[PDB]
Amino acid sequence: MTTLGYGDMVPKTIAGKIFGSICSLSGVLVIALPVPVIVSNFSRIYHQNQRADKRRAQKKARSLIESQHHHLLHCLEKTT
Amino acid sequence: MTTLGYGDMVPKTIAGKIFGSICSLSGVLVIALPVPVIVSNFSRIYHQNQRADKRRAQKKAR
Amino acid sequence: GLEQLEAQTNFTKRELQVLYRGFKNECPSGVVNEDTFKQIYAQFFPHGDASTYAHYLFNAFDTTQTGSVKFEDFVTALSILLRGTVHEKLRWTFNLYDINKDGYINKEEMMDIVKAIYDMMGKYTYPVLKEDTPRQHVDVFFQKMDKNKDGIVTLDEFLESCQEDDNIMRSLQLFQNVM
Amino acid sequence: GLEQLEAQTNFTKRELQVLYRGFKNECPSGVVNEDTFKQIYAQFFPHGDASTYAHYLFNAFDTTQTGSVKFEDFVTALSILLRGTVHEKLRWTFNLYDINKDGYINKEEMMDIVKAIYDMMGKYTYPVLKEDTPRQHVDVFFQKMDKNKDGIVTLDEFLESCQEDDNIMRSLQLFQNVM
Amino acid sequence: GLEQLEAQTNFTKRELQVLYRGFKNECPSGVVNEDTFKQIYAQFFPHGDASTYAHYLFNAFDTTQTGSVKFEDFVTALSILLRGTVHEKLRWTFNLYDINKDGYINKEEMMDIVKAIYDMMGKYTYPVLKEDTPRQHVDVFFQKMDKNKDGIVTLDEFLESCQEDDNIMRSLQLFQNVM
Amino acid sequence: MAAGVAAWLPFARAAAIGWMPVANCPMPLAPADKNKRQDELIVLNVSGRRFQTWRTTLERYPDTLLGSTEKEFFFNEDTKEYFFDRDPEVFRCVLNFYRTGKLHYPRYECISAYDDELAFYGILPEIIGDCCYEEYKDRKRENAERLMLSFRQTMWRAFENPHTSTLA
Amino acid sequence: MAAGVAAWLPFARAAAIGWMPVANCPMPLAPADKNKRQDELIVLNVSGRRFQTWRTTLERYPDTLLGSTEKEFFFNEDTKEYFFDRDPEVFRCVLNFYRTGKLHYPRYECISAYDDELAFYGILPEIIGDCCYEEYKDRKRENAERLMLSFRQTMWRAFENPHTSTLA
């Protein structure tokens, strides 16, 4: 089922051969179900962390009103 | 781990068989991590150069 | 309702629109909670801490005992503090000073307010800094504010000394024309 | 056409626009079928069943024998039921009661309508519930509605008792002013 | 400011809007640098080189010594060159000719300007081409422009011969009406 | 007759007349008549762009801004136009909520802009029509993600990030 | 009272009154009063399409075009309307920057068109809100990419491209 085929045990009937030939394809099919999602999520998490580090680095990159505003600040130095 | 299986050395215990069966799947898993990105970037660079040549040719139209 | 509120506060109609817009534009009228005062005030006082003082007039503005009151009860106190009567402004500030909400200010109690302002002053005092001097600045209060000479002050006992200090009756009337 | 219809119904122009809009807004004028009555009516009668009664005035509104008539023949009956003449409203309701479409109401026939209203009443009757009482409420009908004293009623035999019951000639005229 | 600039240059208001639009539309007012002159001018002189001459009035326009001056100091020289006074236009052109920025034009110095124009002429001169003739076209200059007969010219020594050549005082006034 | 929210109530008022003959009860209840006045085009003027709608469209949802009586802080009676200084490409979806009843999501709005418009107008994002609901959630999650002592503890701080100092 | 940028300053002016009793200092500073006048709807007329906004919205960022005093080269006092001969689908995002404070990116603009509008109005692309920032960078990179002697050197020129001549 895993397409190793050591060769230590091989069928020698005319029915065993049929069922082994079916078995190999069935293994190729069954095992090829996770390897899509697993590699997809590996890529997914790695690119997520990549954009995470670059986002943090981009973060590490980073009058008639002042009269009225500083008037308060003056008005606070009433304390001494 | 690479699914060759020459057959020159094969386990003959009842524990060695278990660990070999696990080993083969583990190899299929571990090696199938680069072959997504490598083939993706091969296709990527080839299509990039393809649109590059066609862009230069469209410039040679003008 | 804009009209039910115009006939309570001293503002006009236009000056109620012009600040409902400003209020709602920054907090889309859930209602302001402390976490909005402690930063709306703080953007006016850099080089200093504004949280611990804001945490007293937040309790003052809030007539009810919710954790966030309203807009109507916000402008209802803005109108008083700016264009209200001196005898009403003084009552409002008094309710701010009465930290135990009961009707009595203790020397250390209002010390809790002065240790907040002086905290808002800055990291380093411009002249020499003295930690016992917030201890006189409070007691120099009572020197006028206590016609009992006991060390405890109530609303009448707070006002009956605060109506002749001409300088504040001219600085309790600073902004009542600017707009 | 708005004008071919204004000169038939009692509504004005504005009140025909104002309800073509409402009609079309919920059913984009395919035409109403029962599956639209049984829910447009039912949204007015919670705590009750509205389907089995709606399934009689659906057959009433529908002058032709289609499965969904129109808008023109919808307002043509709205205008009658609201602002029509009493002698016309009564005929309309009569055509509703005549379930066998022939011109005769049997005691059990109109019982089929009263067992529909009382069904629309609710799950539990507010006072005591009695299943034989829909059996008197129908017969108390004939006590006026039968000048033959036979137990069968036709249009003249239905009206000639229904023009002096002042209370309905004031409740056949409830909505003819509200809008 | 549009008004602080109207009262300096000879243009009107409308003719200042109509060219701020044009200026800003191609260079969104960073400020023009040489790499913009050498192509804005060059689009007017095909079949020729416009860079090496543009690289003198770029230094002329630029009153300060930046690498890109402004818009205000752009129209301040446009207004002079088009609708300014002859005694001011002549001074401006003189400041263009004075390559060493000091106040003196040498025969080979202004030769550096004439070898630029004649370069702008084209690849092949329409009549016979002679490289010693830019050498007379400069000296024929001094034949008028030198009331000292020494071979060195200053602003007064440049103008005091350039005010009677009627043809230029009619071609120093070509565009002062077109717009 | 009446429009907007009470738009089908004439139909039920008409159907009611099916009862009056069999209604042996003495009297009915006199109706609920009160003051009357027609519909009118309210003129919303969202940042220069003018939207218009029947008032009875606006008052179908009365715990909101446009529906309640607190859109009177935005009335400019020198012109009789409601002027909102807001975005005019997201007031469209808000308005079509009031017309039909299902709130939508345009594929291409910066989800932050959409959320705070909904906040300002009173609408809740809970009520988004299901036709376009989960793509709102996709944008939501992607946006959220995009947003996401002397000595005895200095050793701790240095360990879990060797790139703090050189000793680590 | 005041609006726009100084919109919360009444709140601080009010809070200040908490000091006046305990303010033993002799005098305060008299206020900063000066000329006064109300807000008004500035009428931007971007290529036929009319936008409107309170003037105090425009003057929140004064190192720009619309905020500074050099949007007076675009005033058309025969009408009292600012007429810009620019694009009317990217002035929307520019304007919503002035309203809120975060500049956005519509998913579907030809990034060249967006960049040069930002250039013309004074805005810098640095300031784009993070909610929609890196898709701007994706479009940026893709667009950039889309944009991207006798004898002794003639041998060099012919070698590295055999398709120059036939001898190579």
XYZ file of N, CA and C in Angstrom, chain F:
504
model
N -54.246 55.393 1.624
C -54.172 55.036 3.029
C -52.735 54.995 3.512
N -52.522 54.369 4.664
C -51.210 54.368 5.291
C -50.212 53.588 4.450
N -48.938 53.936 4.601
C -47.853 53.369 3.816
C -46.765 52.831 4.726
N -45.718 52.304 4.111
C -44.534 51.923 4.850
C -44.677 50.691 5.715
N -44.675 50.876 7.033
C -44.746 49.732 7.932
C -46.180 49.241 8.055
N -47.137 50.155 8.126
C -48.536 49.759 8.172
C -49.144 49.747 6.784
N -48.472 49.104 5.840
C -48.886 49.228 4.452
C -49.920 48.203 4.059
N -49.936 47.057 4.730
C -50.916 46.014 4.476
C -52.064 46.048 5.458
N -52.080 47.010 6.342
C -53.120 47.072 7.343
C -54.463 47.454 6.730
N -54.525 48.165 5.601
C -55.822 48.278 4.927
C -56.387 46.944 4.521
N -55.537 46.003 4.137
C -56.037 44.698 3.740
C -56.702 43.999 4.910
N -56.097 44.068 6.093
C -56.718 43.432 7.247
C -57.944 44.192 7.704
N -57.911 45.519 7.635
C -59.105 46.292 7.938
C -60.254 45.893 7.028
N -59.955 45.571 5.773
C -61.001 45.136 4.859
C -61.489 43.745 5.208
N -60.563 42.813 5.413
C -60.944 41.458 5.780
C -61.801 41.437 7.031
N -61.565 42.367 7.956
C -62.333 42.392 9.193
C -63.823 42.473 8.935
N -64.230 43.151 7.863
C -65.647 43.291 7.568
C -66.309 41.944 7.322
N -65.529 40.881 7.159
C -66.146 39.574 7.093
C -66.839 39.150 8.375
N -66.562 39.818 9.491
C -67.109 39.410 10.776
C -68.390 40.132 11.132
N -68.535 41.376 10.694
C -69.588 42.229 11.230
C -70.987 41.623 11.195
N -71.406 40.873 10.172
C -72.744 40.269 10.250
C -72.862 39.227 11.340
N -71.946 38.255 11.377
C -71.998 37.209 12.393
C -71.575 37.718 13.759
N -71.183 38.985 13.863
C -70.736 39.571 15.125
C -71.947 39.960 15.970
N -72.440 38.989 16.732
C -73.626 39.259 17.530
C -73.331 40.161 18.718
N -72.062 40.308 19.098
C -71.694 41.206 20.182
C -72.333 42.575 19.970
N -72.671 43.273 21.042
C -73.353 44.562 20.884
C -72.609 45.535 19.989
N -71.411 45.926 20.377
C -70.720 47.024 19.726
C -69.320 46.591 19.334
N -68.715 47.271 18.374
C -67.282 47.122 18.134
C -66.508 48.146 18.953
N -65.195 48.114 18.791
C -64.353 49.177 19.306
C -64.212 50.240 18.233
N -64.551 51.479 18.571
C -64.301 52.581 17.659
C -62.827 52.581 17.254
N -62.500 53.034 16.038
C -61.134 52.853 15.528
C -60.104 53.669 16.283
N -58.860 53.653 15.821
C -57.777 54.358 16.500
C -57.379 55.632 15.776
N -58.342 56.354 15.212
C -58.026 57.503 14.376
C -57.335 58.595 15.182
N -56.426 59.303 14.522
C -55.723 60.438 15.112
C -55.330 61.391 13.987
N -54.380 62.283 14.267
C -53.918 63.226 13.258
C -53.409 62.487 12.029
N -53.561 63.122 10.874
C -53.223 62.512 9.602
C -52.381 63.471 8.779
N -51.424 62.917 8.037
C -50.652 63.705 7.086
C -49.920 62.766 6.143
N -49.680 63.249 4.930
C -49.201 62.420 3.840
C -47.710 62.135 3.977
N -47.213 61.279 3.088
C -45.787 61.006 3.017
C -45.071 62.148 2.324
N -43.765 62.217 2.538
C -42.947 63.244 1.931
C -41.552 62.693 1.725
N -40.856 63.252 0.746
C -39.504 62.828 0.419
C -38.527 63.487 1.375
N -38.054 62.735 2.357
C -36.940 63.190 3.161
C -35.693 63.194 2.297
N -34.914 64.271 2.398
C -33.749 64.493 1.555
C -32.476 64.307 2.348
N -31.958 63.098 2.388
C -30.700 62.883 3.060
C -29.610 63.426 2.162
N -28.655 64.137 2.732
C -27.619 64.761 1.910
C -26.288 64.281 2.441
N -25.890 63.086 2.033
C -24.716 62.457 2.609
C -23.495 62.926 1.842
N -22.721 63.812 2.447
C -21.481 64.317 1.880
C -21.663 64.743 0.438
N -22.570 65.673 0.231
C -22.767 66.202 -1.093
C -23.682 65.360 -1.935
N -23.633 64.052 -1.767
C -24.444 63.172 -2.591
C -25.829 63.053 -1.991
N -26.849 63.378 -2.756
C -28.193 63.479 -2.219
C -28.950 62.176 -2.432
N -29.394 61.556 -1.338
C -30.313 60.428 -1.345
C -31.690 60.913 -0.947
N -32.717 60.205 -1.387
C -34.077 60.603 -1.084
C -34.901 59.391 -0.728
N -35.883 59.573 0.147
C -36.697 58.421 0.501
C -37.977 58.870 1.187
N -39.027 58.064 1.073
C -40.267 58.356 1.779
C -40.041 58.267 3.275
N -40.598 59.211 4.026
C -40.359 59.204 5.462
C -40.764 57.884 6.087
N -41.874 57.314 5.633
C -42.336 56.038 6.152
C -41.408 54.885 5.813
N -40.484 55.075 4.882
C -39.409 54.111 4.737
C -38.452 54.217 5.901
N -38.109 55.439 6.289
C -37.142 55.627 7.355
C -37.673 55.154 8.688
N -38.957 55.309 8.947
C -39.417 54.953 10.282
C -39.859 53.513 10.414
N -39.273 52.583 9.673
C -39.580 51.178 9.894
C -38.739 50.552 10.982
N -37.650 51.190 11.393
C -36.771 50.649 12.424
C -36.409 51.779 13.368
N -37.049 51.853 14.529
C -36.988 53.061 15.360
C -36.008 53.011 16.520
N -35.209 51.960 16.657
C -34.079 51.988 17.572
C -32.766 52.244 16.843
N -32.779 53.109 15.840
C -31.601 53.405 15.044
C -31.408 54.918 14.969
N -30.425 55.362 14.189
C -30.244 56.801 14.049
C -31.268 57.373 13.095
N -31.233 56.937 11.846
C -32.103 57.526 10.847
C -33.567 57.328 11.185
N -33.910 56.249 11.881
C -35.302 56.023 12.208
C -35.791 56.816 13.395
N -34.954 56.988 14.407
C -35.392 57.590 15.653
C -35.502 59.094 15.482
N -35.624 59.804 16.594
C -35.740 61.248 16.571
C -34.436 61.928 16.910
N -33.322 61.223 16.786
C -32.032 61.834 17.036
C -31.245 62.019 15.761
N -31.879 61.843 14.618
C -31.336 62.413 13.404
C -31.714 63.865 13.263
N -32.221 64.487 14.322
C -32.495 65.911 14.286
C -31.305 66.732 14.724
N -30.251 66.095 15.211
C -29.022 66.826 15.422
C -28.278 67.063 14.133
N -28.750 66.516 13.012
C -28.088 66.663 11.723
C -28.940 67.435 10.735
N -30.004 68.065 11.204
C -30.893 68.850 10.365
C -30.312 70.235 10.172
N -30.354 70.726 8.947
C -29.777 72.016 8.594
C -30.887 72.914 8.067
N -31.681 73.480 8.975
C -32.955 74.061 8.557
C -32.795 75.320 7.728
N -31.569 75.794 7.517
C -31.357 76.784 6.475
C -31.602 76.197 5.096
N -31.698 74.872 4.995
C -31.893 74.203 3.726
C -32.925 73.092 3.775
N -33.320 72.633 4.957
C -34.264 71.526 5.106
C -33.697 70.233 4.536
N -32.415 70.002 4.776
C -31.739 68.816 4.292
C -30.908 68.244 5.414
N -31.001 66.946 5.621
C -30.122 66.294 6.570
C -28.746 66.166 5.957
N -27.741 66.767 6.573
C -26.381 66.692 6.059
C -25.543 65.851 6.996
N -25.120 64.688 6.528
C -24.183 63.837 7.229
C -22.810 63.988 6.606
N -21.812 64.218 7.437
C -20.439 64.352 6.964
C -19.742 63.000 6.942
N -20.385 62.012 6.349
C -19.943 60.634 6.413
C -19.587 60.158 5.020
N -19.418 58.869 4.884
C -19.075 58.272 3.601
C -20.326 58.057 2.761
N -20.321 58.445 1.489
C -21.497 58.239 0.637
C -21.523 56.949 -0.165
N -20.630 55.996 0.068
C -20.706 54.713 -0.608
C -21.124 53.594 0.313
N -21.234 53.862 1.605
C -21.752 52.898 2.560
C -23.081 53.332 3.138
N -23.473 54.588 2.970
C -24.845 54.948 3.254
C -25.802 54.291 2.292
N -25.335 53.863 1.129
C -26.223 53.189 0.201
C -26.714 51.877 0.777
N -25.805 51.048 1.291
C -26.207 49.757 1.842
C -27.061 49.926 3.087
N -26.688 50.859 3.954
C -27.519 51.175 5.103
C -28.912 51.537 4.663
N -29.035 52.331 3.611
C -30.364 52.759 3.218
C -31.155 51.606 2.639
N -30.511 50.771 1.841
C -31.227 49.637 1.290
C -31.601 48.640 2.360
N -30.985 48.705 3.529
C -31.514 47.927 4.637
C -32.890 48.426 5.025
N -33.044 49.737 5.148
C -34.331 50.292 5.546
C -35.393 50.055 4.500
N -35.012 50.029 3.230
C -36.011 49.804 2.192
C -36.512 48.368 2.215
N -35.632 47.406 1.962
C -36.070 46.018 1.970
C -36.183 45.494 3.388
N -35.055 45.301 4.047
C -35.069 44.696 5.356
C -33.883 43.794 5.579
N -33.066 43.604 4.552
C -31.871 42.783 4.646
C -30.654 43.624 4.319
N -29.696 43.635 5.224
C -28.489 44.422 5.075
C -27.463 43.639 4.285
N -26.735 44.323 3.421
C -25.859 43.677 2.461
C -24.403 44.023 2.726
N -23.534 43.428 1.935
C -22.109 43.686 2.029
C -21.504 43.776 0.637
N -20.985 44.931 0.233
C -20.331 45.019 -1.071
C -18.970 44.356 -1.026
N -18.663 43.580 -2.063
C -17.488 42.716 -2.019
C -16.206 43.474 -1.698
N -16.176 44.790 -1.895
C -14.905 45.491 -2.017
C -14.716 46.629 -1.020
N -15.369 46.601 0.127
C -15.172 47.665 1.097
C -14.171 47.250 2.162
N -13.292 48.174 2.528
C -12.348 47.904 3.595
C -13.114 47.673 4.879
N -13.234 46.406 5.276
C -14.140 45.967 6.335
C -14.142 46.883 7.546
N -13.030 47.553 7.824
C -13.025 48.523 8.911
C -13.979 49.670 8.614
N -13.931 50.182 7.386
C -14.842 51.242 6.994
C -16.278 50.795 7.104
N -16.576 49.571 6.726
C -17.954 49.130 6.815
C -18.404 49.027 8.261
N -17.585 48.417 9.104
C -17.992 48.236 10.484
C -18.250 49.560 11.169
N -17.401 50.564 10.960
C -17.673 51.756 11.756
C -18.801 52.600 11.184
N -19.116 52.484 9.895
C -20.356 53.087 9.426
C -21.544 52.441 10.110
N -21.589 51.113 10.102
C -22.673 50.437 10.795
C -22.751 50.885 12.242
N -21.605 51.088 12.869
C -21.618 51.565 14.238
C -22.265 52.926 14.326
N -21.890 53.832 13.435
C -22.361 55.200 13.570
C -23.863 55.287 13.369
N -24.411 54.520 12.431
C -25.817 54.694 12.090
C -26.762 53.984 13.040
N -26.255 53.162 13.935
C -27.095 52.413 14.830
C -27.271 50.962 14.460
N -27.024 50.600 13.225
C -27.176 49.221 12.797
C -26.149 48.364 13.514
N -26.492 47.107 13.746
C -25.643 46.074 14.315
C -25.223 45.096 13.243
N -23.956 44.696 13.216
C -23.514 43.730 12.207
C -24.139 42.360 12.359
N -24.749 42.066 13.501
C -25.463 40.808 13.666
C -26.493 40.582 12.570
N -27.118 41.641 12.068
C -28.335 41.491 11.287
C -28.056 41.327 9.801
N -26.798 41.138 9.410
C -26.486 41.071 7.991
C -27.253 39.926 7.361
N -27.825 40.175 6.187
C -28.562 39.126 5.508
C -27.661 37.947 5.199
N -28.228 36.748 5.279
C -27.410 35.555 5.141
C -26.860 35.395 3.740
N -27.539 35.955 2.742
C -27.067 35.888 1.365
C -25.619 36.321 1.261
N -25.258 37.361 1.992
C -23.883 37.839 2.066
C -23.532 38.006 3.535
N -23.238 36.896 4.202
C -22.924 36.908 5.622
C -21.533 36.382 5.902
N -21.184 35.223 5.365
C -19.944 34.611 5.794
C -18.727 35.205 5.113
N -18.880 35.814 3.938
C -17.763 36.555 3.365
C -17.450 37.782 4.197
N -18.473 38.355 4.823
C -18.227 39.336 5.864
C -17.365 38.741 6.964
N -17.616 37.484 7.338
C -16.817 36.857 8.386
C -15.398 36.573 7.915
N -15.225 36.223 6.642
C -13.885 36.003 6.115
C -13.075 37.282 6.170
N -13.653 38.373 5.669
C -12.985 39.661 5.768
C -12.736 40.025 7.216
N -13.689 39.718 8.086
C -13.529 40.020 9.495
C -12.305 39.327 10.068
N -12.203 38.015 9.862
C -11.105 37.262 10.457
C -9.769 37.675 9.862
N -9.711 37.852 8.542
C -8.460 38.264 7.928
C -8.025 39.626 8.446
N -8.969 40.558 8.590
C -8.637 41.885 9.093
C -8.142 41.817 10.528
N -8.862 41.089 11.381
C -8.439 40.947 12.765
C -7.018 40.414 12.838
N -6.759 39.303 12.146
C -5.417 38.736 12.082
C -4.394 39.769 11.635
N -4.713 40.525 10.580
C -3.814 41.583 10.127
C -3.545 42.599 11.227
N -4.512 42.819 12.112
C -4.273 43.729 13.223
C -3.395 43.088 14.291
N -3.585 41.797 14.558
C -2.834 41.102 15.606
C -1.327 41.214 15.437
N 12.963 41.991 37.832
C 13.041 42.681 36.549
C 14.450 43.189 36.300
N 15.186 43.421 37.385
C 16.580 43.826 37.259
C 17.426 42.688 36.703
N 17.489 41.579 37.427
C 18.335 40.454 37.056
C 17.594 39.127 37.014
N 16.735 38.852 37.998
C 16.161 37.516 38.127
C 15.145 37.235 37.025
N 14.590 38.281 36.419
C 13.707 38.101 35.277
C 14.334 38.561 33.967
N 15.457 39.281 34.022
C 16.165 39.617 32.792
C 16.741 38.366 32.148
N 17.133 37.386 32.965
C 17.564 36.104 32.419
C 16.427 35.420 31.671
N 15.224 35.432 32.252
C 14.052 34.909 31.559
C 13.807 35.648 30.251
N 13.851 36.981 30.288
C 13.587 37.767 29.087
C 14.615 37.490 28.001
N 15.876 37.308 28.382
C 16.918 37.052 27.400
C 16.844 35.650 26.815
N 16.464 34.649 27.612
C 16.456 33.276 27.116
C 15.513 33.126 25.931
N 14.213 33.319 26.168
C 13.198 33.025 25.163
C 13.326 33.884 23.915
N 14.317 34.765 23.855
C 14.668 35.468 22.627
C 16.168 35.708 22.658
N 16.963 34.761 22.162
C 18.415 34.981 22.119
C 18.804 36.268 21.424
N 17.964 36.787 20.529
C 18.274 38.003 19.791
C 18.004 39.269 20.587
N 17.764 39.154 21.894
C 17.679 40.341 22.735
C 19.056 40.964 22.929
N 19.972 40.221 23.533
C 21.327 40.680 23.788
C 22.313 39.715 23.145
N 23.594 39.931 23.431
C 24.644 39.059 22.922
C 24.963 37.914 23.874
N 24.830 38.133 25.185
C 25.059 37.051 26.137
C 24.079 35.904 25.912
N 22.807 36.224 25.657
C 21.845 35.184 25.317
C 22.191 34.523 23.992
